[PDB]
Amino acid sequence: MKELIRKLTEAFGPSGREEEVRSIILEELEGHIDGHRIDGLGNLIVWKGSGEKKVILDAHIDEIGVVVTNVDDKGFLTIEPVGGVSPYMLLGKRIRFENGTIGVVGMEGETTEERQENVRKLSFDKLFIDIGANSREEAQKMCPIGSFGVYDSGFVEVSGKYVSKAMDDRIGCAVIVEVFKRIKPAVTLYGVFSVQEEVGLGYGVPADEAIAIDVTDSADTPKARHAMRLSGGPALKVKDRASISSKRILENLIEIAEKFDIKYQMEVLTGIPSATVSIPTRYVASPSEMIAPDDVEATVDLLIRYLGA
Amino acid sequence: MKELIRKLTEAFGPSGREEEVRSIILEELEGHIDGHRIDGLGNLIVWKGSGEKKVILDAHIDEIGVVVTNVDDKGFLTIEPVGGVSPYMLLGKRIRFENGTIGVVGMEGETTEERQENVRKLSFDKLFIDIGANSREEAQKMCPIGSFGVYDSGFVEVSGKYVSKAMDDRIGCAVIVEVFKRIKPAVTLYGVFSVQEGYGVPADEAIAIDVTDSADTPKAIKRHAMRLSGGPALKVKDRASISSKRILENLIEIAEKFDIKYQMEVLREGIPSATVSIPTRYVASPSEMIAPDDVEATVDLLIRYLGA
For chain A, the three-class secondary structure string (H helix, E strand, C coil) is: CHHHHHHHHHCCCECCCCHHHHHHHHHHHCCCCCEEEECCCCCEEEEECCCCCEEEEEEECCECEEEEEEECCCCEEEEEEECCCCHHHCCCCEEEECCCCEEEEEECCCCHHHHHHHHHCCCCCCEEEECCCCCHHHHHCCCCCCCEEEECCCCEEECCEEEECCHHHHHHHHHHHHHHHHCCECCEEEEEEECCCCCCCCCCCCCCEEEEEEEEEECCCCCCCCCECCCCCCEEEECCCCCHHHHHHHHHHHHHHHHCCCCCEEEECCCCCEEEEEEEEECCCCCCEEECHHHHHHHHHHHHHHHEC
Of residues B180, B213, B154, the one with CA closest to residue B27: B180
Cα angle A29-A40-B224, degrees, rounded to a multiple of 5: 130
B117 burial type by CB count under 10 A (0-12 exposed, 13-18 middle, 19+ buried): exposed
Same domain, B245 and B282: yes
Q: Are strands A209-217 and A54-60 parallel, antiparallel or unpaired?
A: parallel
Query: Are residues A262 and A298 in contact, defined by beta-carbon separation less than 8 angstroms?
Result: yes
Cα B46 from chain centroid (whole Å)? 18
Total residue count of chain A as it appears in this document:
309
CA distance B199 to A64: 27
Give yes or no for B151 touching A (CB within 8 A): no
CA distance B90 to B72: 20
Same domain, A42 and A139: no
Helix, strand, or coil (residue B221): coil
| Nominal resolution (angstroms) | 1.8
Same domain, A120 and A236: no
User: How far A205 CA sits from the closest chain B CA (Å)?
Assistant: 6
The parent domain of residue B258 ranges over 1-63+153-308
Same domain, B92 and B235: no
Cα angle B47-B8-B237, degrees, rounded to a multiple of 5: 65
Same domain, A55 and A14: yes
Query: Are residues B105 and B127 in contact, defined by beta-carbon separation less than 8 angstroms?
Result: yes
Same domain, B146 and B70: yes
Question: What sign has the CA pseudo-torsion B247, B253, B254, B255?
Answer: positive
What is the arrangement of strands in the sheet containing B54-60, beginning at the earlier edge strand? B35-38, B44-48, B188-194, B54-60, B205-213, B273-280, B233-236, B263-266
Cβ pair A37:B82 closer than 8 A: yes
User: Residues A99-136, buried b or exposed e (16+ Cβ, 10 A)?
Assistant: eebebebebeeeeeeeeeebeeeeebebbbbbbebeee
Q: Which of B16, B41, B140 sits opposite A35 (nearest CB)?
A: B16
Same domain, B110 and B202: no
Same domain, B180 and B246: yes
Cβ atoms within 10 Å of B74's Cβ, excluding its own: 13
User: Residues B26-59, buried b or exposed e (16+ Cβ, 10 A)?
Assistant: bebbeeebeebeeeeebbbbbbbbeeeebbbbbb
Cβ pair A50:B144 closer than 8 A: yes
To the query of whether residue A197 is one of the catalytic residues in this protein, the response is yes
Of residues A19, A16, A25, A17, the one with CA closest to residue A171: A25
B209 beta partners: B276
State the structure-solving technique. Answer: X-ray
Contacts of B196 in chain A (CB under 8 A): 38
* C-alpha dist (Å) from residue B169 to A143, B63, B148, B214: 33, 7, 18, 14
Residue type, A213: I
* Interacting residues of A265 by C-beta distance below 8 A, sequence separation 6+: A228, A229, A232, A233, A234, A235, A236, A280
CA distance B129 to B96: 11
Query: For chain A, what is the domain count?
Result: 2
CA distance A71 to A135: 9
